Amino acid sequence: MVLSPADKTNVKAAWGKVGAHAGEYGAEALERMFLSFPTTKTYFPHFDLSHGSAQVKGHGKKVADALTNAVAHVDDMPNALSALSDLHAHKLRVDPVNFKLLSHCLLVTLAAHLPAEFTPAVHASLDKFLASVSTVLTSK
């Protein structure tokens, strides 16, 4: 997308209260994705995707930290995520629907931990953000 200054703050604030819960939320969001949309598992063939699994956990953390670094470089995401882009778009060839699937599950995950800060405005701002991240990661 193209983030409004109001988006940029709301996203840093909202993803500011995740803090140490990054690997928990990212673990939840993945599991939510894998259950709700089982096709997504197809990209993790030899993975242990069980509840509480160590791999979903470790991977959950890797997801969440990428986002934390994204929010940081929000004005320059394509440069910041250029390694991840080649991975998800050139090596892994992930179908764009899957990014919609995971962004929804992160959004659902945040709604269920941050009941206070997850207002209509911040929800919208987070949506734009995750869309923007999805855009970068789907292109070479």
Partner: protein, 147 residues
């Protein structure tokens, strides 16, 4: 669809019994309007919709919100066929309203984001999965006479 297992069928009504059928409808639709601002073109008859709190505060959105849940609860009743249950509604939304069917998916996602906002960790991943099956079948039913 896909089907909802008996456990999924039992986890869903349980949660759906705690949701205020008179206030959470306008909560879902309201965020659809603010999260996805282009959908505000379908509800121009509803007066002020220029700011988040206004859209949430606009009374007609609230009142029209209840009708939404109306249809959804109605569809919860008969997972037998959302297609038939939403035949009337499909024709209204599709042929007469020209609402792009992707917006169906979005409402069913905002709804799910709204349920998660109320019920915290009671909205577990398996409860989410079950609901995703419901908002999918419903969005698919509504878009049946485009098929």
């Amino acid at each position: 669809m896909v089907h909802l297992t008996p456990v999924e069928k039992s986890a869903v009504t349980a949660l759906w019994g705690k949701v205020n059928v008179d206030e959470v409808g306008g909560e879902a639709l309201g965020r659809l309007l603010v999260v996805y601002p282009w959908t505000q073109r379908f509800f121009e008859s509803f007066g002020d919709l220029s700011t988040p709190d206004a859209v949430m505060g606009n009374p007609k959105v609230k009142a029209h919100g209840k009708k939404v849940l109306g249809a959804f609860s109605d569809g919860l009743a008969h997972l037998d066929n959302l297609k038939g249950t939403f035949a009337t509604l499909s024709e209204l939304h599709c042929d007469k309203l020209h609402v792009d069917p992707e917006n169906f998916r979005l409402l069913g996602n905002v709804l799910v984001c709204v349920l998660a906002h109320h019920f915290g960790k009671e909205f577990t991943p398996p409860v989410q999965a079950a609901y995703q099956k419901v908002v999918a079948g419903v969005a698919n039913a509504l878009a049946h006479k485009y098929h």
